Amino acid sequence: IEVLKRKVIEKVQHIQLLQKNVRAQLVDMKRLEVDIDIKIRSCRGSCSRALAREVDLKDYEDQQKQLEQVIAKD
Amino acid sequence: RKVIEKVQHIQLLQKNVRAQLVDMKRLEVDIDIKIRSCRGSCSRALAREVDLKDYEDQQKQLEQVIAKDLLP
Amino acid sequence: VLKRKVIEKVQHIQLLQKNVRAQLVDMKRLEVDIDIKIRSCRGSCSRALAREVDLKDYEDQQKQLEQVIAKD
Amino acid sequence: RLEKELEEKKEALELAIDQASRDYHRATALEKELEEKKKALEL
Amino acid sequence: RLEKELEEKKEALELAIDQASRDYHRATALEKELEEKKKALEL
Amino acid sequence: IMKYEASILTHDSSIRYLQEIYNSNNQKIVNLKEKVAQLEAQCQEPCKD
Amino acid sequence: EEIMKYEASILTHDSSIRYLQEIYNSNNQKIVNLKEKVAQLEAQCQEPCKD
Amino acid sequence: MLEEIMKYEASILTHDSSIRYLQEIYNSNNQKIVNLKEKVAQLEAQCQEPCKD
Amino acid sequence: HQLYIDETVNSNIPTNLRVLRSILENLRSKIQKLESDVSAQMEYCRTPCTVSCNIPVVSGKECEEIIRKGGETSEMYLIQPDSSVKPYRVYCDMNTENGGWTVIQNRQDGSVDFGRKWDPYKQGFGNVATNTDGKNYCGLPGEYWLGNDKISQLTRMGPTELLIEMEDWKGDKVKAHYGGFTVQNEANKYQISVNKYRGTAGNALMDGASQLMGENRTMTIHNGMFFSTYDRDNDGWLTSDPRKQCSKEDGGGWWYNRCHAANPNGRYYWGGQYTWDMAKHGTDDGVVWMNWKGSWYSMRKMSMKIRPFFPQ
């Protein structure tokens, strides 16, 4: 209880910061995923051809419903 | 709501079943031929029949069954 | 650049698949040398670790890495 | 020079993370397949 | 050398390889359970 | 209405199971297609003279 | 007995949070190195169709 | 056509990095093996003295 | 009180590692795709796209003179408003209401980058038109912005009206007529000014956001406001912090108040609806016309056409 509660606090601070730091990186990858799909299409008006591609958004928001459904208690 | 979502499955299914019922015809033939095509390679040849009347009897069905759907 | 960059990989999987029998053997030696040297303590220390040592495993995955240098 | 050579060869590694990744994906894809089959079996 | 020394040993990094490993075995177990399940089933 | 929400299940098993047979057959077929390709090579040789 | 795994089962969790943190720091590096590869797809997509 | 010879440099990317990795498990093993032998040299000079009387 | 032992806080921490790893490795395999792509295009972009834009014979001064000169189908005609002013290409709409429309800004497929500096907004950018089927005149319009140097002089010729058309991603269209339109020069920082609104879109240049009120509706008015690009900022913010810029990197050039009720030179968001996390800066930077769709909707199409005003 001092070699056990000094871990399920020291390894719970480590997880709960991490999720918050990953959540931040999940947002930033949405930006880039979209920012790119834009800049890519903005090429047709310059280049031989243009890469016919999509963004899977239902996915970016599916695992963003998670992380926000898992942040309950520590 | 639910009973409507069923047909979407129960038709993607039945359109897939006729697509398989096709190949089971194309194969049964492709097989009857490729075995016949052994008569002159192998000592023995498999004495067989092909009942097609069955395939076109249950192709008679399925289609005769493909009614409307849910539109009107 | 296809014949060039494949027989330049089968080049790698024998300078590093004979270094796999090299280390598989060296692991038979240690697995054994240690059962010896464990009991060599049965007359020095409180207890001795009641342990088994398996070989029908070591010579199982010695037969495979073997018959896998027949074909080149 | 004295150090930086063996240094950058150690960025290995992402090879392994990607190797983990390849393996993770090979694992999960298997789990999905599994449970489906279980249900189907029961079915 | 003042800093390059310690950062090197951090890149001496096994938990990666071991996490590949923790996962390889994981997968190979699943294959075997599945193959049996595929036989399930078909039976 | 009571079992008009129960029969959607009695008739949902009979979808996932029908799809189950189908998917097996489509695998069983792609399997017998290998075993024919193995009877092709076996029937190319002219009778032994 | 139940205090034995309660800390050996935590050394498998220590080297998981330490592994997951190792992805994050690689990901973050591969992201900075995508953005400079994109600001070069920008350079290339300015001139209009050639007449 | 070129269709075959397309995922044949996309196939042997994998095979260059599976090998650059198998030579990586191994190189770890041949560094753990040697690091287990040193710990054995210490189970040796612990099994020389005979039973205390 | 030693029921203070939790086994369940080491039997559901595996859970925070199923989800938390799935996520991290989904994003490693998302950076995977977005690497191949930005490198496949990079390859395509070794050679440019090409057009054969054969000119029609019938010039003019603007696109009315030309329809009155018998040039009677929509395509790209070469024009010249002034004899000292070297002539330039342009697309002319000869089909909307009664033709005569000189097109100045068009959007339809996000095929041109609009987030540009101050200079290439003054000059102009984009493709004016392009070839089509079995023909040799460019009978289809490009995405482009005619230019500030150009649209200034083209309006300071007399009575210049202005049409604004747009489409949502469902197939609905709405017009935004402005019977008057003026744009000053560079020394006067291309200051807009408009009057006589009518249409189904909703006055958003003079009135502002039709969902902001009073002081809030006051600061969403482009009318009389200057023109600003991400490298030259002349917006309504006299809070001097470059943190309070209307036009931030990769954002369009436009007549920015504090900041906008609509922005046709915004970024082209596929699908229509976009959100906080999608926008490179959190801002509402897309192709927005608030008075019709809201603040987080970017338009499928968005044209800007002009015509002189003879007492109708």
From Swiss-Prot, chain C:
PTM (free text): It is well known that heterologous expression of isolated domains can lead to adventitious protein modifications.
Domain of life of the source: Eukaryota
Subcellular location: Secreted
Tissue-level expression: Detected in blood plasma (at protein level).
Comment text on domains: A long coiled coil structure formed by 3 polypeptide chains connects the central nodule to the C-terminal domains (distal nodules). The long C-terminal ends of the alpha chains fold back, contributing a fourth strand to the coiled coil structure.
Disease named in the record: Congenital afibrinogenemia: Rare autosomal recessive disorder is characterized by bleeding that varies from mild to severe and by complete absence or extremely low levels of plasma and platelet fibrinogen.
Role played: Cleaved by the protease thrombin to yield monomers which, together with fibrinogen beta (FGB) and fibrinogen gamma (FGG), polymerize to form an insoluble fibrin matrix. Fibrin has a major function in hemostasis as one of the primary components of blood clots. In addition, functions during the early stages of wound repair to stabilize the lesion and guide cell migration during re-epithelialization. Was originally thought to be essential for platelet aggregation, based on in vitro studies using anticoagulated blood.
Quaternary structure note: Heterohexamer; disulfide linked. Contains 2 sets of 3 non-identical chains (alpha, beta and gamma). The 2 heterotrimers are in head to head conformation with the N-termini in a small central domain.
Name of this chain's protein: Fibrinogen alpha chain
Originating species: Homo sapiens
Annotated gene: FGA
Residues of the full protein shown: 140 to 211 of 866
From Swiss-Prot, chain G:
Transmembrane portions of the chain: none
Localization in the cell: Secreted
Binding partners and assembly: Heterohexamer; disulfide linked. Contains 2 sets of 3 non-identical chains (alpha, beta and gamma). The 2 heterotrimers are in head to head conformation with the N-termini in a small central domain.
Tissue: Detected in blood plasma (at protein level).
Disease in which the protein is involved: Congenital afibrinogenemia: Rare autosomal recessive disorder is characterized by bleeding that varies from mild to severe and by complete absence or extremely low levels of plasma and platelet fibrinogen. Dysfibrinogenemia, congenital: A disorder characterized by qualitative abnormalities (dysfibrinogenemia) of the circulating fibrinogen. Affected individuals are frequently asymptomatic, but some patients have bleeding diathesis, thromboembolic complications, or both. In some cases, dysfibrinogenemia is associated with low circulating fibrinogen levels (hypodysfibrinogenemia).
Upper taxonomic lineage: Eukaryota, Metazoa, Chordata, Craniata, Vertebrata
Record's comment on post-translational modification: Conversion of fibrinogen to fibrin is triggered by thrombin, which cleaves fibrinopeptides A and B from alpha and beta chains, and thus exposes the N-terminal polymerization sites responsible for the formation of the soft clot. The soft clot is converted into the hard clot by factor XIIIA which catalyzes the epsilon-(gamma-glutamyl)lysine cross-linking between gamma chains (stronger) and between alpha chains (weaker) of different monomers. Sulfation of C-terminal tyrosines increases affinity for thrombin.
Gene: FGG
Name of the featured protein: Fibrinogen gamma chain
Parent-protein residues present: 117 to 167 of 453
Remaining remarks: The gamma-chain carries the main binding site for the platelet receptor.
Domain of life: Eukaryota
UniProtKB/Swiss-Prot annotation, chain I:
Hydrolase as UniProt keyword: no
GO CC terms: blood microparticle; cell cortex; cell surface; collagen-containing extracellular matrix; endoplasmic reticulum; external side of plasma membrane; extracellular exosome; extracellular region
PTM section of the record: Conversion of fibrinogen to fibrin is triggered by thrombin, which cleaves fibrinopeptides A and B from alpha and beta chains, and thus exposes the N-terminal polymerization sites responsible for the formation of the soft clot. The soft clot is converted into the hard clot by factor XIIIA which catalyzes the epsilon-(gamma-glutamyl)lysine cross-linking between gamma chains (stronger) and between alpha chains (weaker) of different monomers.
Residue positions with a glycan: N216
Phenotype for R18C: In CAFBN; fibrinogen Longmont
Tissue: Detected in blood plasma (at protein level).
Limits of the Fibrinogen C-terminal domain: 54-310
Residue pairs linked by disulfide bridges in the UniProt entry: C53-C138, C63-C92, C246-C259
Protein location: Secreted
Coiled coil: 1-44
GO molecular function, one term: protein-folding chaperone binding
Principal subcellular localisation of the protein: secreted
Keywords: Adaptive immunity, Blood coagulation, Coiled coil, Disease variant, Disulfide bond, Glycoprotein, Hemostasis, Immunity, Innate immunity, Pyrrolidone carboxylic acid, Secreted, Signal
GO biological process, one term: induction of bacterial agglutination
Recorded consequence of changing A187T: In Pontoise-2
Subunit structure as annotated in this protein's UniProt entry: Heterohexamer; disulfide linked. Contains 2 sets of 3 non-identical chains (alpha, beta and gamma). The 2 heterotrimers are in head to head conformation with the N-termini in a small central domain.
Domain notes: A long coiled coil structure formed by 3 polypeptide chains connects the central nodule to the C-terminal domains (distal nodules). The long C-terminal ends of the alpha chains fold back, contributing a fourth strand to the coiled coil structure.
Protein's name in the database: Fibrinogen beta chain
Organism: Homo sapiens
Organism phylogeny: Eukaryota, Metazoa, Chordata, Craniata, Vertebrata
Gene: FGB
